[PDB]
Design a protein around this ligand. Structure first.
Ligand SMILES: CCCC[C@H]1CN(c2cccc(OC(F)(F)F)c2)C(=O)CN1Cc1cncn1Cc1ccc(C#N)c(F)c1
Ligand SMILES: CC(C)=CCC/C(C)=C/CC/C(C)=C/COP(=O)(O)OP(=O)(O)O
Ligand SMILES: O=S(=O)(O)C[C@H](O)CNC1CCCCC1
Ligand SMILES: O=S(=O)(O)C[C@H](O)CNC1CCCCC1
Ligand SMILES: O=S(=O)(O)C[C@H](O)CNC1CCCCC1
Ligand SMILES: [Zn+2]
Lengths: 485, 316
């Protein structure tokens, strides 16, 4: 199971060579190598049977991390005003982290989460970063709010899902107001255009059964043209004057590669002709694995070439690996296994370098020397989950899902903005609902593929690739909106 | 000390509106008196849809305290256009925000909307400002994406001259001279030389580009940015790998490597081995390629042991 995933402590650690050519990049790289390798040198190898004397123990300090997150349910200091337009993210980072850590909220606290988020929902459509009498709707808090309601809500009259169901038409209308002719979306009225908006929108549209042909037109082309010569994806593509061509607008980054791979994967479920336009999956897989750092930097991921490793890219880059793998498998299949990244080294980075020092605030962090925060806690743990559990998209599981789908059950069809913007007839709309639902529920944990570095007390729960919520949350949530059971 | 807005003569007609997130919200933030007071009056201003100078002042107060507050930036831009305010003065304010380290996606997008609406007939002054702004962080992702947008938008309008493109390549070359490991500047070179619609593609330009890439590799053999640019270049133009192998083979033990390699250059260079393996595949020598992938997996690039084993198995 680990023949091709060597431990960082078993490899020779050496600095990135200078070639006798100093530069500012290399100065900061070498400083970061010293910082990470020194902490590994002070820490007992997690794979050892009895822990060494005098060294730090690297076990996952779940109770410290739980108490770090507890402040979300009382109050946050004044410095959090920089996140006052992102309060649904503060909710998501907290409640998804507690799910991964296996800590249950009581019903009263869940009801407070639900009630807070419903105050962020505008009647005209979508969630804002705060109360609807204060902030306008935005695609990114709409994803964070919808996912948080999947984690904390339920189907009762106080559970929030009923309110989401009643908002489906207005959320759809908000999404269509955001839509650009070239396939991009603004994140809000007058806002920026990049694949973060596309990802957040496609996740929500998939979960709530509000996908239409008019919503999706050119969305595949916008995303495909974000892929760079390095194989990852940039923030956006520019349409030159439907357009004569599209050009990517910056360098490949883990955050935008995650959003692009996940968006493209969601579009492959949609039964439209010649849709979605293909990406280069081999190049994206190559870019992904090349971002995993060397042993001297603890095997964490960097977000782009020649920058620094950072624990949050365990999710953004590591979590894209199963998606790229599946796209590669499909292409090999169309023409006619060992782990694809070092699943052991990534766990070692999480346990040894990304946890706050013991006996302190708790929380997980970017790198040693950085304060922990809720965002790095969520994304370190999400990436740790992908490393611990071998995730794959199972064709036989999708086939079983198709066989049980009941197309005669569901919520009212979206009314399109343009007269011919919907599906052609009920046969086509129901075929689309079946495919989109069945593929959304196609991710599995592979039997016998678990690797828990440091022993079973380090195990956390399994997240889902693409959505990043637990499968035990995803299934009853999406079943609610498609009226399946 | 602080004078509440309720006691200010200029605001006496306005009844503030409290934040409404319910009786016991989760993730509440302990706001300063100044921030709560300003948002209390912003809620009232936005509710009555007032477009005024006092509203404009209020939005600046708020975004100075929270530069990521997208709702207030949206309101600010609508104030600027409704009142026909000087957009050049607002650009000077955005320059000051950068100096004062007030930054976010929202400030960068506000700047983009200003340039779009001003629509200068020649954007040279903004190009030169953006160049200088990279001094505190030469890899700022927002800045590089904005520079791409600026040249793409104004070239669509026909407003980028050949002299302007030429001095942009000169500037890019200098950025990579100062730090050849700046992957952001490599990405910019790709736009200037390969992907922008106006780029030249001729036998000469392909020869010039290959010379630049190979010189860059020989200067910094372990620079991943240069290797990725080489592989993307050859793939994009469907150019064979074998004819270039003489310049690559010395790293696996047109411009050629230094006869003594530079100091601190341990061999082999893993991406040189990847080149060699892919060259064998180009020659349909799958067993030779498999042997190179096997050495990458077990000896020379062991962090990627599983990926290189995957590539080895594909050879069969
Ligand atoms: C607790 C502070 C975290 C700051 C972090 C995340 N954050 C952000 C804010 C709101 C929603 C949100 O949403 C989602 F992304 F889903 F979390 C993300 C930022 O704005 C900048 N960040 C700095 C960063 C820390 N480590 C790597 N970076 C780089 C970076 C830059 C931009 C984005 C975006 N977008 C990003 F995510 C990371
Ligand atoms: C769903 C969603 C909103 C996804 C977005 C996730 C994400 C991580 C985006 C990164 C975007 C960005 C501009 C990074 C550069 O920041 P930097 O220069 O501070 O960091 P770097 O040095 O690691 O590149
Ligand atoms: O590190 S964690 O597992 O998250 C939790 C902390 O270690 C708690 N340690 C206690 C100290 C006193 C004796 C009982 C245990
Ligand atoms: O009825 S809806 O349009 O859905 C909801 C209200 O209009 C929201 N308006 C707020 C006023 C203050 C600034 C942020 C928005
Ligand atoms: O289940 S196994 O992997 O065989 C072994 C256990 O998980 C070991 N966990 C430690 C026990 C003592 C306290 C610190 C954690
Ligand atoms: Zn980070």
């Amino acid at each position: 199971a680990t023949e091709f995933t060597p431990s960082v402590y078993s490899l020779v650690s050496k600095p990135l060579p200078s070639n006798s050519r100093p530069s500012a990049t290399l100065d900061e790289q070498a400083e970061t190598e010293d910082l990470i390798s020194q902490l590994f040198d002070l820490t007992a190898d997690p794979n050892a049977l009895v822990s060494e004397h005098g060294k730090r123990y690297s076990g996952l300090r779940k109770q410290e991390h739980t108490q770090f997150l507890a402040s979300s349910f009382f109050q946050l200091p004044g410095k959090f005003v920089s996140l006052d337009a992102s309060r649904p993210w503060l909710v998501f980072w907290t409640v998804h982290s507690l799910d991964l850590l296996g800590v249950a909220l009581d019903q009263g606290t869940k009801d407070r989460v639900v009630s807070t988020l419903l105050h962020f929902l505008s009647p005209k459509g979508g969630f804002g970063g705060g109360p609807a009498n204060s902030q306008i709707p935005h695609l990114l808090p709409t994803y964070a709010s919808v996912c948080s309601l999947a984690i904390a809500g339920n189907d009762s009259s106080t559970g929030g899902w009923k309110d989401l169901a009643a908002a489906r038409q207005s959320i759809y209308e908000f999404f269509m107001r955001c839509k650009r002719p070239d396939g991009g979306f603004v994140v809000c009225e007058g806002g920026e255009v990049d694949v973060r908006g596309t990802y957040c929108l496609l996740v929500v549209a998939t979960l709530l059964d509000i996908i239409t042909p008019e919503l999706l037109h050119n969305v595949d082309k916008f995303v495909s043209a974000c892929q760079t010569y390095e194989g990852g994806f940039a923030c956006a593509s520019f349409p030159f004057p439907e357009p004569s061509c599209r050009v990517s607008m910056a360098e490949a980054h883990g955050g935008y590669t995650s959003c692009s791979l996940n968006s493209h994967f969601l579009l492959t479920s949609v039964p439209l002709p010649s849709f979605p336009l293909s990406i280069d999956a081999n190049a994206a897989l190559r870019w992904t694995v090349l971002q995993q750092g060397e042993p001297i930097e603890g095997g964490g991921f960097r977000g782009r070439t020649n920058k620094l490793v950072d624990g949050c890219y365990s999710w953004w880059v590591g979590g894209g690996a199963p998606v790229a793998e599946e796209l590669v498998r499909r292409e090999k299949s169309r023409k006619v296994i060992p782990p694809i990244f070092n699943r052991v080294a990534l766990q070692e980075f999480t346990l040894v370098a990304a946890q706050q020092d013991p006996g302190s605030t708790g929380g997980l962090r970017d790198k040693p020397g950085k304060r922990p925060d809720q965002y790095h806690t969520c994304n370190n743990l999400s990436g740790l989950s992908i490393a611990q559990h071998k995730m794959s998209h199972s064709p036989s599981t999708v086939s079983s899902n198709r066989l049980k789908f009941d197309a005669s059950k569901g919520l009212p069809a979206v009314k399109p903005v343009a007269p011919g913007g919907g599906w052609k007839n009920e046969d086509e709309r129901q075929n689309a609902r079946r495919e989109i639902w069945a593929n959304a529920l196609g991710w599995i944990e592979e039997e016998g593929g678990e690797i828990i570095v440091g022993g079973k007390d380090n195990r956390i729960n399994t997240t889902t690739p693409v959505f990043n919520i637990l499968g035990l949350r995803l299934k009853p949530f999406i079943n609610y909106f498609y009226c399946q059971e | 000390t602080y004078i509440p807005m309720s006691q200010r003569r200029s605001w006496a007609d306005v009844k503030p509106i409290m934040q409404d997130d319910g009786p016991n919200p989760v993730v509440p933030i302990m706001y300063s008196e100044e921030y709560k007071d300003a948002m209390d009056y912003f809620r009232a201003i936005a509710a009555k849809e007032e477009k005024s100078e006092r509203a404009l002042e209020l939005t600046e107060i708020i975004v100075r305290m929270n530069p990521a507050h997208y709702t207030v930036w949206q309101y600010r831009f609508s104030l600027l256009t409704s009142l026909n305010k000087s957009l050049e003065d607002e650009l000077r304010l955005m320059n000051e925000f950068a100096v004062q380290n007030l930054k976010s996606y929202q400030v960068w997008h506000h700047r983009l909307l200003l340039l779009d609406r001003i629509s200068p007939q020649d954007p040279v002054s903004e190009i030169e400002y953006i160049h200088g702004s990279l001094l505190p962080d030469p890899k700022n992702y927002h800045t590089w994406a904005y520079l791409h947008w600026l040249y793409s938008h104004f070239s669509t309008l026909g407003r980028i001259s050949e002299a302007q493109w030429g001095s942009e390549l000169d500037w890019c070359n200098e950025m990579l001279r100062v730090d050849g490991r700046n992957n952001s500047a490599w990405g910019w070179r790709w736009y200037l030389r390969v992907s922008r619609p106006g780029a030249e593609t001729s036998s000469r330009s392909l020869q010039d580009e290959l010379i630049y890439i190979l010189k860059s590799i020989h200067l910094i053999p372990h620079n991943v940015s240069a290797w990725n640019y080489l592989r993307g270049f050859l793939k994009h133009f469907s150019l064979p790998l074998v004819p270039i192998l003489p310049a690559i083979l010395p790293y696996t033990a047109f411009p050629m490597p230094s006869d003594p390699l530079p100091e601190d250059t341990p061999l082999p260079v893993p991406l040189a081995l990847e080149y060699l393996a892919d060259s064998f595949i180009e020659q349909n020598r799958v067993d030779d390629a498999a042997k190179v992938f096997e050495k990458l997996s077990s000896e020379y690039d062991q962090m990627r042991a599983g990926y290189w084993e995957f590539r080895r198995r594909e050879c069969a």
